[PDB]
Design an enzyme around this catalytic site. Structure first.
Site, PDB file in Angstrom:
ATOM      1  N   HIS A  60       8.074  69.348  64.422  1.00 30.58           N
ATOM      2  CA  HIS A  60       8.266  68.178  65.274  1.00 30.58           C
ATOM      3  C   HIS A  60       7.051  67.970  66.158  1.00 30.58           C
ATOM      4  CE1 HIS A  60      12.510  69.796  64.719  1.00 30.58           C
ATOM      5  NE2 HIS A  60      12.537  68.637  64.083  1.00 30.58           N
ATOM      6  N   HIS A  90       3.782  70.634  74.396  1.00 26.87           N
ATOM      7  CA  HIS A  90       3.741  70.002  73.074  1.00 26.87           C
ATOM      8  C   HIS A  90       3.238  68.557  73.242  1.00 26.87           C
ATOM      9  CE1 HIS A  90       7.902  68.859  74.384  1.00 26.87           C
ATOM     10  NE2 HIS A  90       7.387  67.674  74.098  1.00 26.87           N
ATOM     11  N   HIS A  92       3.263  64.341  71.834  1.00 25.72           N
ATOM     12  CA  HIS A  92       3.819  63.234  71.062  1.00 25.72           C
ATOM     13  C   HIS A  92       2.569  62.366  70.788  1.00 25.72           C
ATOM     14  CE1 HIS A  92       7.907  64.403  71.821  1.00 25.72           C
ATOM     15  NE2 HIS A  92       7.528  64.720  73.045  1.00 25.72           N
ATOM     16  N   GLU A 102       5.815  58.338  74.812  1.00 25.55           N
ATOM     17  CA  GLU A 102       7.252  58.124  74.897  1.00 25.55           C
ATOM     18  C   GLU A 102       7.528  57.243  76.120  1.00 25.55           C
ATOM     19  OE1 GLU A 102       9.096  62.196  74.489  1.00 25.55           O
ATOM     20  OE2 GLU A 102       9.380  61.455  72.450  1.00 25.55           O
ATOM     21  N   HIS A 115       3.652  66.925  77.031  1.00 21.26           N
ATOM     22  CA  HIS A 115       4.799  67.283  77.858  1.00 21.26           C
ATOM     23  C   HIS A 115       4.687  68.763  78.179  1.00 21.26           C
ATOM     24  CE1 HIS A 115       7.584  63.823  76.456  1.00 21.26           C
ATOM     25  NE2 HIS A 115       6.775  63.442  77.456  1.00 21.26           N
ATOM     26  N   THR A 194      13.637  64.692  75.336  1.00 21.39           N
ATOM     27  CA  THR A 194      13.525  63.517  74.463  1.00 21.39           C
ATOM     28  C   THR A 194      13.757  63.832  72.992  1.00 21.39           C
ATOM     29  OG1 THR A 194      11.122  63.681  74.140  1.00 21.39           O
ATOM     30  CG2 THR A 194      11.927  62.514  76.084  1.00 21.39           C
ATOM     31  N   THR A 195      14.140  65.072  72.726  1.00 25.85           N
ATOM     32  CA  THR A 195      14.410  65.527  71.357  1.00 25.85           C
ATOM     33  C   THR A 195      15.748  66.243  71.403  1.00 25.85           C
ATOM     34  OG1 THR A 195      13.165  67.585  71.844  1.00 25.85           O
ATOM     35  CG2 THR A 195      12.026  65.951  70.480  1.00 25.85           C
TER      36      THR A 195
END
Ligand SMILES: [Hg+2]
Ligand SMILES: [Zn+2]
Length: 256
Positions: A60, A90, A92, A102, A115, A194-195
């Site tokens: 992810h 991590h 995005h 995001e 993040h 958010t996951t």
């Protein structure tokens, strides 16, 4: 779950009904309706003796894990009550420069969003913290193309090692301070992960100033794969969840 047509953000609610909750992340930050709060204490980022451990492609995102056994790299102040320990970082990222983040600012999307996940020390550990409405504090930092970011180059140089889902590599001696912009001005509001599991435990602190990354770094960050080795190649791009309804929440700003 994933980010594709049949397991993406639009399908999440079936397994994690909280996806349609009252405080989901990310959200669009309307810079005009954001309430400046002159009573917020300055945000304190003490990444002084951070202790990175490994980096992993969990399918992810790439995830840099830290030793959170005691107060090493912590976040305090600002809207935060107490101390929050850094556990992981991590990213995005999008497939094009105008998408990837995001959180959005007045509907604008950045090329990527880093993040930095922290958990509340009054809870014992991460697992315990995610059972609390104030168990996590996530520091979001936008990325915009500009000059190379030395702090991100550290990550860039190990991406081939962890190209596919499940690959991990040693990542000790990584100083997370090199991922921060000059200014610590931020927007904050109560949200969620958010996951999946999308748990509503987080105090979001989204920095107003994005850090810059070179075009070369961005391209390298888009070379990771969602797939495991030997499977058809699915570039890890657009691994972002869209803005969620703000419901009755108020976003505060630390600046005028
Ligand atoms: Hg929670
Ligand atoms: Zn994230």
């Amino acid at each position: 779950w994933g980010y594709g047509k049949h397991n993406g953000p639009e399908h999440w609610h079936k397994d994690f009904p909280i996806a349609k909750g009252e405080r989901q992340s990310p959200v669009d930050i309307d810079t005009h309706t954001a309430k400046y709060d002159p009573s917020l204490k300055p945000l304190s980022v003490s990444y002084d003796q951070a202790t990175s451990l490994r980096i992993l492609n969990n399918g992810h995102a790439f995830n840099v894990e830290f030793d959170d056994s005691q107060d090493k790299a912590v976040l305090k102040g600002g809207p935060l009550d107490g101390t929050y320990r850094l556990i992981q970082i991590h990213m995005h990222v999008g497939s094009l420069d105008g998408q990837g983040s995001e959180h959005t600012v007045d509907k604008k999307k950045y090329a990527a969003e880093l993040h930095l996940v922290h958990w509340n020390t009054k809870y014992g550990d991460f697992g315990k913290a995610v059972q609390q409405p104030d168990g996590l504090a996530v520091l979001g930092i936008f990325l915009k193309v500009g000059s190379a970011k030395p702090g991100l180059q550290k990550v860039v140089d190990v991406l081939d090692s962890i190209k596919t889902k499940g690959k991990s590599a040693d990542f000790t001696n990584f100083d997370p301070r090199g991922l921060l912009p000059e200014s610590l001005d931020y927007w904050t509001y109560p949200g969620s992960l958010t996951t999946p599991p999308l748990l509503e435990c987080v105090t979001w602190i989204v920095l107003k100033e994005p850090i810059s990354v070179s075009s070369e770094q961005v391209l390298k960050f888009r070379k990771l794969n969602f797939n495991g080795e030997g499977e058809p190649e699915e570039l890890m791009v657009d691994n972002w969840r869209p803005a969620q309804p703000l419901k009755n929440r108020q976003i505060k700003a630390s600046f005028k």
